[PDB]
């Protein structure tokens, strides 16, 4: 408290120089907190999982001597054909 402010300023400047710290005695806004902020892009981007997953359609190419069956896809195709038999199928999409 009784210590002169010049002595503490010299201490602060020399210490900041030693430890590689920004010495900003004027207190001006420097945007240094922006530089020191961490990049959160990777964690944010991996939110929904790794997209490079093996999928059912790849199985036909990896293991051609095994012919796998996707029950959901076959059921979807059967329903599509059943609707198209009743005349309840989707119309032809308009084209340019």
């Amino acid at each position: 408290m009784n210590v002169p402010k010049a002595r503490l300023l010299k201490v602060a400047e020399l210490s900041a120089k030693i430890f590689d710290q920004n010495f900003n005695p004027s207190g001006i806004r420097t945007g240094s907190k922006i530089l020191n902020e961490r990049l959160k892009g990777p964690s944010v981007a991996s939110y929904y999982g790794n997209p490079d997953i093996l999928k059912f359609r790849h199985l036909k190419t990896l293991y051609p001597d095994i012919e796998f069956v996707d029950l959901e896809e076959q059921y979807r195709l059967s329903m599509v054909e059943a609707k198209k038999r009743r005349g309840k199928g989707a119309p032809k999409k308009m084209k340019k």
Binding site: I28, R29, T30, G31, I34, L35, E37, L39, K40, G41, P42, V44, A45, Y47, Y48, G49, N50, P51, D52, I53
Partner: protein, 112 residues
């Protein structure tokens, strides 16, 4: 207009709906432009710099599209796509959390 978004982005591996696609696209482009946004923000927010440089940086920030904004990213449930009551510890809405927890899918989680 083959792809609904300006930049081709791989689909997430699990459940999909239009809102999950929109959120995932914004997350990928935020990852890609984070350094640019931070650099422009630093230039705009440094009072040591001239006012014209700061104004130019702010103008470039306002010119960026919506899919680079960090504040536009919203945590959705990875199983149902809902955006309410999402627990960040599992990225699941509360119902999907309860379902998975009772099925033993969530490691360590027990009925209290």
């Amino acid at each position: 207009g083959n792809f609904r978004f300006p930049i081709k982005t791989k689909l997430p591996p699990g459940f999909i709906n239009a809102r999950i696609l929109r959120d995932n696209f914004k997350r990928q482009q935020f990852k890609e432009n984070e350094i640019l946004v931070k650099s422009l923000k630093f230039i705009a927010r440094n009072m040591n710099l001239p006012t014209k440089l700061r104004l130019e940086a702010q103008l470039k920030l306002n010119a960026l599209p919506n899919y680079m904004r960090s504040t536009q990213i919203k945590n959705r449930c990875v199983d149902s796509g809902h955006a309410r009551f999402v627990l960040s510890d599992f990225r699941l809405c509360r119902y999907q959390f309860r379902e998975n927890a009772l099925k033993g899918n969530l490691p360590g989680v027990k009925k209290g």
